[PDB]
Design an enzyme around this catalytic site. Structure first.
Site, mmCIF file in Angstrom:
data_model
loop_
_atom_site.group_PDB
_atom_site.id
_atom_site.type_symbol
_atom_site.label_atom_id
_atom_site.label_comp_id
_atom_site.label_asym_id
_atom_site.label_seq_id
_atom_site.Cartn_x
_atom_site.Cartn_y
_atom_site.Cartn_z
ATOM 1 N N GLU A 254 9.170 -43.132 -42.313
ATOM 2 C CA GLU A 254 9.646 -41.763 -42.213
ATOM 3 C C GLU A 254 8.929 -40.965 -41.138
ATOM 4 O O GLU A 254 9.565 -40.135 -40.481
ATOM 5 C CB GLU A 254 9.496 -41.077 -43.557
ATOM 6 C CG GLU A 254 10.063 -41.891 -44.689
ATOM 7 C CD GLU A 254 11.450 -41.447 -45.059
ATOM 8 O OE1 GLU A 254 12.076 -40.748 -44.241
ATOM 9 O OE2 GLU A 254 11.913 -41.789 -46.166
ATOM 10 N N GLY B 137 -15.146 -50.297 -24.854
ATOM 11 C CA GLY B 137 -14.505 -51.315 -24.053
ATOM 12 C C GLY B 137 -13.665 -52.261 -24.878
ATOM 13 O O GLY B 137 -12.534 -52.581 -24.508
ATOM 14 N N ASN C 132 -14.454 -36.884 -33.027
ATOM 15 C CA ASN C 132 -15.682 -36.805 -33.803
ATOM 16 C C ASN C 132 -16.235 -35.395 -33.866
ATOM 17 O O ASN C 132 -16.832 -35.020 -34.877
ATOM 18 C CB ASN C 132 -16.734 -37.740 -33.224
ATOM 19 C CG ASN C 132 -16.446 -39.183 -33.527
ATOM 20 O OD1 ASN C 132 -16.509 -39.610 -34.675
ATOM 21 N ND2 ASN C 132 -16.122 -39.945 -32.498
ATOM 22 N N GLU D 145 -18.722 -58.432 -30.073
ATOM 23 C CA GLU D 145 -20.106 -58.758 -30.361
ATOM 24 C C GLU D 145 -20.269 -59.093 -31.833
ATOM 25 O O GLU D 145 -19.671 -58.436 -32.689
ATOM 26 C CB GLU D 145 -21.023 -57.593 -30.005
ATOM 27 C CG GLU D 145 -20.509 -56.249 -30.474
ATOM 28 C CD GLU D 145 -21.462 -55.124 -30.151
ATOM 29 O OE1 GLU D 145 -22.676 -55.395 -30.030
ATOM 30 O OE2 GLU D 145 -20.994 -53.972 -30.007
ATOM 31 N N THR E 213 -20.705 -39.623 -25.864
ATOM 32 C CA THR E 213 -21.800 -40.573 -25.870
ATOM 33 C C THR E 213 -21.746 -41.586 -24.743
ATOM 34 O O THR E 213 -22.767 -42.219 -24.462
ATOM 35 C CB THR E 213 -21.835 -41.329 -27.201
ATOM 36 O OG1 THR E 213 -20.786 -42.301 -27.215
ATOM 37 C CG2 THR E 213 -21.647 -40.369 -28.357
HETATM 38 N N1 GTP Z 1 -15.580 -41.544 -35.727
HETATM 39 C C1 GTP Z 1 -16.359 -42.572 -35.422
HETATM 40 N N2 GTP Z 1 -16.473 -42.972 -34.117
HETATM 41 C C2 GTP Z 1 -17.265 -44.012 -33.798
HETATM 42 C C3 GTP Z 1 -17.966 -44.689 -34.768
HETATM 43 N N3 GTP Z 1 -18.664 -45.671 -34.173
HETATM 44 C C4 GTP Z 1 -18.419 -45.634 -32.848
HETATM 45 N N4 GTP Z 1 -17.562 -44.602 -32.606
HETATM 46 C C5 GTP Z 1 -17.003 -44.205 -31.312
HETATM 47 O O1 GTP Z 1 -16.852 -45.345 -30.503
HETATM 48 C C6 GTP Z 1 -16.935 -44.961 -29.154
HETATM 49 C C7 GTP Z 1 -17.496 -46.096 -28.309
HETATM 50 O O2 GTP Z 1 -16.896 -47.325 -28.643
HETATM 51 P P1 GTP Z 1 -17.587 -48.231 -29.765
HETATM 52 O O3 GTP Z 1 -16.724 -48.254 -30.996
HETATM 53 O O4 GTP Z 1 -18.957 -47.689 -30.061
HETATM 54 O O5 GTP Z 1 -17.711 -49.701 -29.145
HETATM 55 P P2 GTP Z 1 -16.367 -50.470 -28.765
HETATM 56 O O6 GTP Z 1 -15.188 -49.569 -28.993
HETATM 57 O O7 GTP Z 1 -16.278 -51.727 -29.583
HETATM 58 O O8 GTP Z 1 -16.533 -50.845 -27.219
HETATM 59 P P3 GTP Z 1 -17.754 -51.789 -26.799
HETATM 60 O O9 GTP Z 1 -19.050 -51.065 -27.056
HETATM 61 O O10 GTP Z 1 -17.641 -52.125 -25.340
HETATM 62 O O11 GTP Z 1 -17.691 -53.048 -27.616
HETATM 63 C C8 GTP Z 1 -17.833 -43.740 -29.130
HETATM 64 O O12 GTP Z 1 -17.210 -42.724 -28.393
HETATM 65 C C9 GTP Z 1 -17.939 -43.287 -30.563
HETATM 66 O O13 GTP Z 1 -17.495 -41.959 -30.666
HETATM 67 C C10 GTP Z 1 -17.858 -44.291 -36.081
HETATM 68 O O14 GTP Z 1 -18.481 -44.887 -36.949
HETATM 69 N N5 GTP Z 1 -17.051 -43.230 -36.408
HETATM 70 MG MG MG Z 2 -18.239 -51.700 -28.952
#
Ligand code: GTP
Ligand code: MG
Ligand code: GDP
Ligand code: GDP
Lengths: 426, 50, 50, 143, 427, 426
Positions: free
Chosen positions: E244, E134, E196, E61, E169
């Site tokens: 290493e 995803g 997290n 996106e 989430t």
């Molecule tokens: N530690 C951490 N985890 C994050 C953060 N942003 C999103 N996540 C994790 O990302 C997971 C969901 O995937 P996202 O990164 O939000 O979105 P995506 O991986 O690109 O997958 P899509 O939404 O389908 O595009 C959630 O379980 C969040 O815990 C972040 O800023 N820090």
């Molecule tokens: Mg995403």
């Protein structure tokens, strides 16, 4: 040639020894920086007895400091003549004994005393021909009396052919600083009669009265008492460090003063001891020294010698004197006061002269008397031992550590038969 | 949750307990026996010296 | 309550947290001291033999 | 000359009250005497030094001249998050109030003022090289 | 020696948004791109007075990507390097692995190819992704697969973000997690779990920030990454490169899942008060109260441990501290190795970021170990994957994208086989 | 004349060699820019043993650095005495082995070893008469041990008539850096027992212990450790560089130390090592040096020498000394510690004297003892290797590279019969 290793144990031993090394270094002309600054070459041929040359005129004392609390070591290093000790000789614990003889003999000794033994072994083999050891410690404290006691036992079973001096302050009821004073004194004396070659009893009470009347000091801090004790010790070993018309070595004094291997507790005195206000009105001759020497208020123990009899006695003189006058003086003092001496020994006085007086005086002397009156001090202690021991006061802080009650019964039994044989030979 | 916390603490306290060190005890024993042997050898050698 | 009881019993049996390390260091210190004594005895004995 | 200090810059510290009275010319009131006493020192040494007296007077001048409000928070929540973050109040109660409000403020009320120089040396047991490293110890023996 | 970093997904490039902020402040590079050789491992110096990172942000996106394009770091990142699809994978592994990956993965790989050819002494790749989503899971696995085909022998450090057990989430993250592992097993060389919930606990306990957002989480994740590459960037007393971990931490070709941790996480007021030394941080890095993954290593037995040290630290006391750890009995090691550590010392202390909640600290520790508690985590996720797959829930979304039940069954048994492997090696 | 080339492998080897060339250059009086600025003509006579003439008073060291990561090379060029090495001698790979012995012995060696062999062959042909080669490296790392090991094998098959010294650190479990320490150390030892003439076993453990006990430092960085090892290397090689009353070259020491062709693992010790606080409180005597030499706490290996018997031992003295004092001191040590020496070899002690002390001291000594206590260290390592190999841990990063399993079994067999024959001769 003849060598003396010096050992200081506990707070009393360290402070006394610190002042002792000041006095000796002054006598031999070494400045507090450790370099030679004297004038006479007579001081040069007899510094191997007490010092080791390190690198071009740097003489380090042959001493071993031993305690359990850094306060004492810093008070040592802060004072003048405090930077001359080899820092390797400051074998030293960390937790503290705390007037517990069991802690000084079973708990903390088990990790400190192997180390002190290695240090003293290296220092003993640094020299070639040992003459003896010299141990300064107290009898009331824990880190001094108990640990020094074990160190004496270990040394006596390591080097059994060398002499051993020990200067120990003893408790008194009036000056009664520690509360377990009898529990410490009885056990220490019990070990000293089986290990030490001879002991020279000191106490603070007699030193107080001496600086009251003779010295006329108003505020006699501990530095002055240790100055007196130091003057005594230097007077003892003056004969090894200086030539004289009649030399008397450590072993020579011992064999002259000890008739029986358990009768080796001496009372000591020093002379001249005159106030600064009265040094002008007096004379400097051997009878003036002698008639102050034999005075009972000049002894450094709380035992009136005219309450008993002298077994033997010895005088060590320093300065240009007449030996005839020395012997006739000893003869007259033994003939006049004839009852106070023992009967079955002729010539109860050993005398000696050395040709170097201490700095500041023209003629000095040191008195070492093996009297039988010391049994009063031992009774004074043993009765307090039995008083506390009847109802087991303060007992568990020794019992709960590994020491049993049988040690106390043995210690009291030895003290009792010891005063019995003093009384018997009187 | 609280039961799990207490169970973990119990197993930890169980892990902390002992001080056995059996191989070190055996090493100590052999050292003491060697010391005894060398002491009796020493007194024997002194007798031979005399 | 059962886990609390067992926890208290194990806490009474472990004798303290620093106990295991104190015991291990005590064993090690004893080992070092014994080894040093043994070496000194060997020195004494070899002096005798020479 | 018996104190063996140059006295020209020294007043007797007991003269502080009369000095305040002569400075004001009118009289000292309670809130004036309190500030004077808390900003200068009146407890440890009878002799005074001009530079010490000046150092105290500067703080006193500032204290009289300006005022910081004790209300550094107008929002209980923000104050509370500071409390949980362990960020402490910047201002000092001695500068802020005239007297102590509570007994613990009264406990710590006098710490701010500049101490007088110790007229004598201090005996302190200080660690030495032998104690710190060179001296033999059980830990060293064991390695 | 150069290493390039690719970021996949929503969480990936937000981690990058914190990582590159940290790198630029470390090497003194303003966000406009020019300084006012240590940088050479991350920024290649084009032309005159301009350094451009060795990275590719990618997502499906365009929302978060062009937020970067319009953020403060417009000039720093190469315009072509940021890669954005047209529409999201929408929490759908099959969609992000077969439908949209087939369009985006070719452009991504044909870009990293010319980034590698720009490079000279490539150490390896390091990837940033979260498997709950995803985009990160699906084309992350697809991209890793074709990278393993293209290079293979080069190391790939995977800093993945697994879902927490209770704090979560999404809903279909068990399906996406399992399906992502099934290829994360045989593709990644060295994989580091970041959860997290454990970071929330750290920020609550140590940093005492009761209301943490994602910025703070990504800030101290960047601290961890920077701490384990600081050996490559700056010279230290005892340095350790990226190859290493490959040897010293992976005892078996399919057991590579490393817990991470960091110490000292200390705020501004707790520094100027605690007296910091090496012994206490070496201790504090081993409590479960300071790990980056919510699991109890008290239950597990360690296989290997790596200790990064930054700042004022000498090899003596770090050796004494690791001795104390080895002799303590509250933690236990596996018998399969008596030598369970690998130290590493670098001179430069960890830098501080403006607005960051950490303080200027003299020395810090980054622990990366390997134990059997991770084998416990996978079973915990495997349970709630079975729960939802027993009722055939949500399956129609994946089958509609074009997949079947065969890969569900085989991924399920692959995780069971891996469970067998941990309980076997733990013996 | 007689020549010694220097080869440094691995990060530890590079930094050790850096300090080594610093201290040797200081000994010969050549400044860190590479020009001679010393005083005595005695230094000029024996610099061809370690140097080559470049231009206008510029002397380059006959050293070959070898590594696989530029961080080592930068650290060498950064420090002082870093701009004196010939850049052509900076033969240096690009990838890095990463603590993988197979990567350091089969993959990357195949392309680096032709180059290092070319440059060492050029440096060996450039000089006239080789005395031997001198290699400093580790036994835990991958790029150091493995690559240096193959280099040793290639060199020994090429020049079988020249001596060889290997300064190699051995990892200890208490100072445990990397995880594959036994997998690398066992393989490297397996090659060193058939390739190297003799080895000087080192470890950081004894160095840390020595800095704790004797030096009493606060922060023992790697600089001081490498300073100690460099002092040992200057001591072992001083006999060639300086004339003395009794010289002992490398082959001379080898034939006096190695009674059997597989019994060539030495431990080393260096003296005097005293703290700066106690530096002035001591003297410099031959007994003072000898007690510090034969102390078990002064060995640079983690093997208690009192747990075994010395097969033989050698001491290299530096400084104007009395040979009679040297010989009678060795006699006293051989008499007093009569059980720690083997019986079927009388006079287990070799000694030599050089007339130039190391700079900053008055008199020094280097100890090289071939004892039987090293079997403890090999057991200490082999048991770890068997513990890992019993369950095939970490094995596949080696097997999947070209090595097979019987190599590990052979290294075990070679470790096992070596410790067996050490135990036999004990
Ligand atoms: N530690 C951490 N985890 C994050 C953060 N942003 C999103 N996540 C994790 O990302 C997971 C969901 O995937 P996202 O990164 O939000 O979105 P995506 O991986 O690109 O997958 P899509 O939404 O389908 O595009 C959630 O379980 C969040 O815990 C972040 O800023 N820090
Ligand atoms: Mg995403
Ligand atoms: N003359 C003298 N006696 C002392 C000094 N310090 C302590 N004592 C005596 O030592 C006795 C107690 O000994 P203590 O200091 O407890 O020995 P330690 O604690 O074991 O070292 C007291 O009765 C004191 O009279 C000193 O500096 N000079
Ligand atoms: N004395 C000393 N030892 C070192 C130094 N650097 C590393 N070591 C030791 O070398 C071992 C690891 O060797 P390593 O550097 O990995 O060798 P390499 O990777 O093959 O070059 C560790 O056990 C360290 O103790 C140093 O500067 N001085």
């Amino acid at each position: 040639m003849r060598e003396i290793v010096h050992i200081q144990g506990g707070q009393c031993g360290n402070q006394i020894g610190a002042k002792f090394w000041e006095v000796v270094s002054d006598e031999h002309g070494i400045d507090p920086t450790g370099t030679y600054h004297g004038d006479s070459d007579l001081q040069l041929e007899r510094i191997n007895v007490y010092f080791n040359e390190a690198t071009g005129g740097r003489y380090v004392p042959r001493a071993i400091l031993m305690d359990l609390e850094p306060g004492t070591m810093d008070s040592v290093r802060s004072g003048p003549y405090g930077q001359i000790f080899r820092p390797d000789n400051f074998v030293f614990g960390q937790t503290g004994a705390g007037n517990n003889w069991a802690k000084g003999h079973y708990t903390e000794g088990a990790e400190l005393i192997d180390s002190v033994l290695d240090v003293v072994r290296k220092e003993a083999e640094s020299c070639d021909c040992l003459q003896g050891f010299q141990v300064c410690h107290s009898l009331g404290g824990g880190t001094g009396s108990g640990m020094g006691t074990l160190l004496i036992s270990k040394i006596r079973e390591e080097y059994p052919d060398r002499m051993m001096l020990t200067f120990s302050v003893v408790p008194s009821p009036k000056v009664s600083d520690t509360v377990v004073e009898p529990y410490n004194a009885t056990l220490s004396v019990h070990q000293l009669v089986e290990n030490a070659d001879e002991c020279m009893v000191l106490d603070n009470e007699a030193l107080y009265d001496i600086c009251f009347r003779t010295l006329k000091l108003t505020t006699p801090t501990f530095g002055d008492l240790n100055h007196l004790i130091s003057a005594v010790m230097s007077g003892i070993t003056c004969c090894l460090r200086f030539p004289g018309q009649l030399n008397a070595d450590l072993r020579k004094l011992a064999v002259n003063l000890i008739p029986f291997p358990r009768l080796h507790f001496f009372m000591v005195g020093f002379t001249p001891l005159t106030s600064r206000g009265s040094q002008q009105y007096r004379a400097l001759t051997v009878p003036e020294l002698t008639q102050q020497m034999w005075d009972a208020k000049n002894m450094m123990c709380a035992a009136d010698p005219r309450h008993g009899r002298y077994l033997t006695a010895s005088a060590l003189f320093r300065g240009r004197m007449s030996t005839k006058e020395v012997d006739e003086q000893m003869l007259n003092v033994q003939n006049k006061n004839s009852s106070y001496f023992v009967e079955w020994i002729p010539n109860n006085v050993k005398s000696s002269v050395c040709d170097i007086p201490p700095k500041g005086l023209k003629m000095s002397a040191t008195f070492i008397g093996n009297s039988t009156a010391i049994q009063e001090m031992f009774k004074r202690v043993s009765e307090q031992f039995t008083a506390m021991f009847r109802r087991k006061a303060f007992l568990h802080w020794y019992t709960g550590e590994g020491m049993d009650e049988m040690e106390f019964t043995e210690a009291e039994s030895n003290m009792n038969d010891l005063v019995s044989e003093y009384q018997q030979y009187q | 949750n609280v039961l799990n916390k207490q169970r973990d603490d119990t197993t930890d306290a169980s892990r902390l307990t002992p001080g056995e060190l059996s191989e070190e005890q055996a090493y100590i024993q052999q050292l003491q026996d060697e010391m005894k042997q060398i002491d009796e050898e020493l007194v024997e050698a002194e007798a031979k010296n005399r | 309550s059962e886990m609390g009881s067992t926890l208290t019993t194990t806490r009474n049996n472990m004798g303290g947290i620093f106990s295991a390390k104190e015991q291990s260091t005590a064993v090690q210190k004893r080992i070092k001291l014994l080894e040093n004594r043994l070496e000194k005895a060997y020195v004494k004995y070899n002096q005798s033999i020479t | 000359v018996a104190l063996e200090v140059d006295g020209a810059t020294h007043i007797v510290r007991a003269k502080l009250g009369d000095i305040l009275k002569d400075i004001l010319g009118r009289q000292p009131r309670k809130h004036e005497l309190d500030a004077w006493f808390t900003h200068l020192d009146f407890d440890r040494s009878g002799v005074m030094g001009i530079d010490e007296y000046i150092k105290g007077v500067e703080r006193l001048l500032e204290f009289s001249a300006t005022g910081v409000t004790p209300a550094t928070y107008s929002s209980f929540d923000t104050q509370r998050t500071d409390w949980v973050r362990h960020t402490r109040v910047g201002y000092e109660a001695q500068q802020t109030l005239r007297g102590p409000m509570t007994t613990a403020q009264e406990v710590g009320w006098h710490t701010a003022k500049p101490a007088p120089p110790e007229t004598a040396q201090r005996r302190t047991l200080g660690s030495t090289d032998v104690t710190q490293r060179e001296g033999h110890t059980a830990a060293s023996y064991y390695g | 020696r150069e290493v390039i970093s690719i970021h996949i997904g929503q969480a990936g490039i937000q981690v990058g948004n914190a990582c590159w902020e940290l790198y630029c402040l470390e090497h003194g590079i303003q966000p406009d791109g020019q300084m006012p050789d240590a940088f050479n491992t991350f920024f290649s110096e084009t032309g005159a007075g301009k350094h451009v990172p060795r990275c590719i942000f990618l997502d499906l996106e365009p929302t978060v990507v062009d937020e970067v394009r319009t953020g403060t770091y417009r000039q720093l990142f190469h315009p072509e390097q940021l890669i954005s699809g047209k529409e999201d994978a929408a929490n759908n592994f099959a969609r992000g692995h077969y439908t949209i990956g087939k369009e985006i993965v070719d452009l991504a790989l044909d870009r990293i190819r010319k980034l590698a050819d720009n490079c000279t002494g490539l150490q390896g790749f390091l990837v940033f992704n979260a498997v709950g989503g995803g985009t990160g899971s699906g084309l992350g696995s697809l991209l890793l697969e074709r990278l393993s085909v293209d290079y293979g022998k080069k190391s790939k450090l995977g800093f993945t973000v697994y879902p927490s057990p209770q704090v979560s989430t999404a809903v279909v993250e068990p399906y996406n997690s399992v399906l992502s592992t099934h290829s994360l097993l045989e593709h990644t060389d060295v994989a580091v779990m970041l959860d997290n919930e454990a970071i929330y606990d750290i920020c609550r306990r140590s940093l005492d920030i009761e209301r943490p957002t994602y910025t703070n989480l990504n800030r101290l994740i960047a601290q961890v990454i920077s701490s384990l590459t600081a050996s490559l960037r700056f010279d230290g007393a005892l340095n350790v490169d990226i190859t290493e971990f490959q040897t010293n931490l992976v005892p078996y070709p399919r057991i590579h899942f490393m817990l991470s941790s960091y110490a000292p996480i200390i705020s501004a007021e707790k520094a100027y008060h605690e007296q910091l030394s090496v012994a206490e941080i070496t201790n504090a890095a081993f409590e479960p109260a300071s790990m980056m993954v919510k699991c109890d290593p008290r239950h597990g037995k360690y296989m290997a441990c790596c200790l990064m040290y930054r700042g004022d630290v000498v090899p003596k006391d770090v050796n004494a501290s690791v001795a104390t750890i080895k002799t303590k009995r509250t933690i236990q090691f596996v018998d399969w190795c008596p030598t369970g550590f690998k130290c590493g010392i670098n001179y430069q202390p960890p830098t501080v970021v403006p607005g960051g909640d950490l303080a200027k600290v003299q020395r810090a520790v980054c622990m990366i170990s390997n134990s059997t508690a991770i084998g416990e985590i996978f079973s915990r996720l495997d349970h709630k994957f079975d729960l939802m797959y027993a009722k055939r829930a949500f399956v129609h979304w994946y089958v509609g994208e074009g997949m079947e039940e065969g890969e569900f069954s085989e991924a399920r048994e692959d995780l069971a086989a891996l469970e067998k492997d941990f309980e076997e090696v733990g013996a």
